[PDB]
Design a protein around this ligand. Structure first.
Ligand SMILES: [Zn+2]
Lengths: 346, 174, 99, 99, 98, 97
């Protein structure tokens, strides 16, 4: 017979708006959380529970049939199940339903610190090399000097880069009561490494005050290069300010706490002749991200040393970078035949 | 007093692990690359080797022993992946990027198959509706037998206790 | 024949030629200054006193001489009259027509 | 066109240097002549310090010849620019600026 | 060119094509090669032998079956309704897909 | 020759190749020629109802068979694939009226 005449006509639109995506929006649009790095079970070749192809999150595979095959045919639309929780609807919903991964540690988005100009480092004011040192877990950066002094008593300034030895030494000289102080205490000494420091710094930022300060610095500088740098940072600051008028667009959303997962029909997994399978690289990249996140969560569960956590967090950042922009990496992820994987930006 | 890294590990000081890591990381990476070809899995196994050295730090006796431990453990981890069905299955899967312009001539479907499947579903539904319409014409006991058998499902035992007839009688009536 | 497509691409992309000839922008007397890092300095003092300094590679031939008076739009050295120099000197309609 | 529109918008307006005792105007704020006159009259009626303002300064610019590639990459539509070249850069700027 | 070329077989060639079918052991069951394949008229399986393989000398018109095959279809959990429907009507929809 | 046939499961567009019973490619230069001629309608049919408007192509086949008016085209599926990739890159793309 003829196709069912879907009366849901597409909603006409005249504009497209783009902006940074908040974690709240990613969670609100998502149907679930991908918890396993599996795609299909190797013994049954069926989508795995809570995996990248999960029928609980992304939709049924068969038309008007659930996973356990108890509810069938059009009579049972909208009934998910009592047993396998898989909605009885059209399989085409596997092209529109998305998922997410809740990262245990925030990971910076590669774009906003690799596609020049360096957006995060222009907002914070740090040069790109130091920002990379922050991101790849090599130095601590102080967000609030507090009452902490230097090793010889020198005043500690905001945005100071301290190694592990320096951080431990400074934490030693701190009073015992200061470590337990609330984050709103002006005297608390806060130093962070990785993407959490960037989150805190970009949250504490004030765009209007920063723009006025940069205009003042450009108007009262005797160096042409310093003026050029000031105006270049002013460009990005004013771009963010203009973005904040149309929608809500915050700098902290450049550091991602949730990783969205695209519908499985756009990252297929097909069976070929000879009994082999062929998968999209996006499945592999999501697998790497999930594996790193799960390993980091387990390591924190057992109170691992502070070098294993650092290595795992840096590896997780690298995995997310490979997922988004593989070519921009210094050492792009490659197959055994030395062919770089294809990411979302590729 | 500048103790050697062996006694730092024995004491329970975490910076010791930083020392052994910074010293033997590349050697263990080479050891892993000798046995496997996946850098991701090799890095995972290196992290596991160092963490398990830290966990078994109460079993070392010599400064060189530490190194030996690392190497030993890391090797066996690689070896275990020769047996894991998950790893074999995931390494038996190619990448669609290996076929140039795979989106043009591969991963295809025909809507005729979907329409035929829906038509078959409609045929089955019509047959079941015919059966449901026939049901009221039957004797009341045999109608309730079928109705129960369609909402619990050919459960001769639980139906027999529900009814009063035995397993044999209930099966015969069904 | 094939030396035409790269030229069209260079012109359409507003690319400077491989030999950008320095062109004087004001009318005045030309003088030769001190040589700086292998590049001769040409100092042009205008009728009203405006002083403009240009750098010309010594390897490139110098068309103008010392104690000479030149008008705007004249090349001080051998090369191709670059489109942006034409824009700066003769105007936007002139550069459009030249292009 | 944007340059002309901005110059026309700022034409006839004034930038406040000192807000005085006015609770509605702030230093660095651009307001129209009528609004400034009304605020000054209101302050005078209240025997408060008058607001001092200076004439807005129009920006100065020169015509520039751009290559076809750069002109295509600098279009006002980010969909058009992202489908030609440097997709990551265009999408980054579009997201940061909320185009 | 003249029609004599076609008349005298001057520029006539022979081109051979090879079509290969794999029947493997899948989880749902071992796929079989047979001339009895569901929902196809008896005319379209006239030239096939016992192993569902076209005879030597047949004319391969477009759309004819060369190597007929049945793959075990996807029986889900046998819901009671399906059990009764098969019990009364029969196994008309035997578990085999073309 | 192809009227309708197999489509892709990713892009929802006709496949490519005689063996795959695919359709011909109307590339960028063909679109440029169509724009130069000024054919909005032909370009629109080529973009939406002949390639990847999943509902639109079925409705158009039915309308040609039944003689009725042509359906109103909808959003192409490749645009939705693009939007999902952009959302997977962490960009909030919003279509507004
Ligand atoms: Zn179910």
């Amino acid at each position: 017979m003829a196709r069912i005449k879907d009366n849901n006509a597409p909603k006409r639109f005249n504009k497209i708006s783009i902006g940074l995506a908040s974690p709240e929006s990613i969670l609100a649009e998502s149907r679930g959380e991908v918890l396993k790095p599996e795609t299909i079970n190797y013994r049954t070749h069926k989508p795995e529970r809570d995996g990248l192809f999960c029928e609980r999150i992304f939709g049924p595979v068969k038309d008007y049939e659930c996973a356990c095959g108890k509810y069938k045919r059009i009579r049972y639309r909208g009934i998910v199940c009592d047993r396998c929780g898989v909605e009885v609807t059209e399989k085409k919903v596997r092209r529109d339903r998305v998922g997410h991964i809740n990262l245990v540690v925030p990971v910076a988005h590669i774009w906003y610190f690799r596609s020049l100009p360096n957006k995060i480092g222009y907002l914070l004011g740090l040069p790109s090399k130091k920002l990379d040192m922050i991101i790849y877990y090599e130095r601590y950066v102080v967000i609030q000097p507090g009452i902490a002094k230097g090793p010889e008593g020198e005043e500690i300034h905001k945005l100071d880069f301290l190694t592990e030895e320096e951080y431990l030494n400074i934490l030693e000289s701190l009073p015992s009561e200061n470590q337990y102080l609330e984050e709103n205490d002006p005297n608390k000494f806060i130093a962070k490494m990785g993407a959490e420091c960037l989150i805190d710094l970009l949250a504490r930022i004030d765009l209007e005050q920063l723009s006025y300060e940069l205009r003042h610095k450009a108007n009262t500088e005797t160096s042409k290069q310093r003026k050029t740098e000031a105006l270049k940072r002013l460009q990005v600051v004013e771009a963010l300010r203009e973005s904040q008028d149309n929608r809500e667009n915050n700098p902290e959303w450049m550091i991602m706490k949730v990783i969205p997962v695209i519908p499985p029909e756009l990252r297929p997994l097909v069976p070929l002749d000879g009994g082999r399978f062929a998968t999209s690289d996006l499945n592999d990249l999501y697998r790497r991200v999930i594996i790193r996140n799960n390993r980091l969560k387990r390591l924190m569960e057992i109170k691992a040393p502070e070098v294993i956590l650092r290595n795992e967090k840096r590896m997780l950042q690298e995995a997310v970078d490979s997922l988004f922009d593989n070519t921009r990496k210094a050492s792009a992820v490659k197959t055994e035949s030395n062919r770089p994987l294809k990411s979302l930006s590729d | 007093m500048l103790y050697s890294d062996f006694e730092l590990l024995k004491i329970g000081d975490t910076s010791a692990l930083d020392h052994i890591h910074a010293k033997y990381f590349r050697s263990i990476l080479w050891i892993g690359r000798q046995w496997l070809n996946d850098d991701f899995l090799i890095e995972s196994l290196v992290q596991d080797t160092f963490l398990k050295l830290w966990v078994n730090r109460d079993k070392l006796e010599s400064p060189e022993h530490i190194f030996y431990f690392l190497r030993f453990v890391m090797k066996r981890e690689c070896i275990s992946y020769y047996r894991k069905p998950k790893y074999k299955f995931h390494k038996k899967v190619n990448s669609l990027e290996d076929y140039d312009n795979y989106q043009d001539y591969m991963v295809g479907y025909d809507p005729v198959n979907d329409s035929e499947n829906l038509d078959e579903q409609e045929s089955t539904q019509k047959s079941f509706d015919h059966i449901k319409s026939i049901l009221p014409l039957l004797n009341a006991d045999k109608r309730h037998l079928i109705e129960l058998c369609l909402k619990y499902g050919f459960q001769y035992k639980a139906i027999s206790k529900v009814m009063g007839k035995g397993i044999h009688e209930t099966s015969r009536e069904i | 024949i094939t030396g035409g497509l790269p030229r069209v691409t260079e012109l359409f992309e507003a690319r400077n030629p491989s030999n950008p000839a320095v062109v004087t922008e004001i009318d005045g007397v030309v003088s030769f200054g001190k040589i700086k890092r292998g590049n001769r300095e040409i100092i042009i003092e205008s009728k009203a006193g405006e002083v403009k300094k240009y750098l010309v590679k010594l390897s490139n031939q110098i068309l103008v001489q010392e104690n000479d008076y030149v008008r705007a739009g004249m090349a001080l050295s051998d090369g191709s009259i670059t489109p942006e120099d034409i824009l700066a000197i003769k105007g936007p309609s002139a550069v459009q027509q030249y292009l | 066109d944007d340059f002309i529109n901005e110059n026309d918008e700022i034409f006839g307006k004034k930038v406040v240097e000192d807000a005085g005792d006015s609770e509605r105007l702030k230093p660095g704020q651009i307001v129209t002549a009528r609004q400034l006159r009304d605020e000054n009259s209101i302050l005078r009626r209240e025997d408060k310090t008058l607001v001092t303002a200076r004439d807005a300064v129009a920006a100065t610019a020169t015509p520039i010849l751009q290559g076809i590639t750069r002109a295509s990459l600098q279009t006002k539509s980010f969909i058009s620019a992202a489908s030609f070249q440097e997709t990551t850069k265009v999408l980054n700027e579009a997201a940061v600026n909320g185009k | 060119i003249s029609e004599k070329v076609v008349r005298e077989d001057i520029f006539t060639s022979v081109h051979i094509d090879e079509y290969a079918l794999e029947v493997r052991d899948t989880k749902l069951g071992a796929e079989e090669l047979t001339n009895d394949i569901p929902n196809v008229s008896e005319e379209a399986t006239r030239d096939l032998d016992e192993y569902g393989m076209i005879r030597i000398g047949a004319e391969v018109k477009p759309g004819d079956i060369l190597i007929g095959k049945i793959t075990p279809k996807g029986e889900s959990d046998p819901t009671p309704e399906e059990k009764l429907l098969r019990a009364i009507f029969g196994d008309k929809a035997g578990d085999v897909k073309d | 020759a192809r009227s309708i046939g197999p489509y892709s499961l990713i892009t929802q567009q006709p496949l490519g190749g005689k063996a795959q019973f695919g359709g011909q490619r109307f590339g960028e230069m063909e679109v440029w020629a169509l724009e130069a001629y000024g054919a909005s309608a032909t370009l629109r049919e080529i973009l939406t109802v002949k390639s990847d408007d999943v509902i639109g192509r079925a409705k158009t086949y039915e309308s040609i068979v039944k003689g009725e008016t042509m359906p109103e085209p909808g959003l192409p599926e490749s645009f939705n694939v693009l939007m999902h990739e952009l959302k997977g890159l962490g960009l909030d793309i919003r279509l507004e009226e």
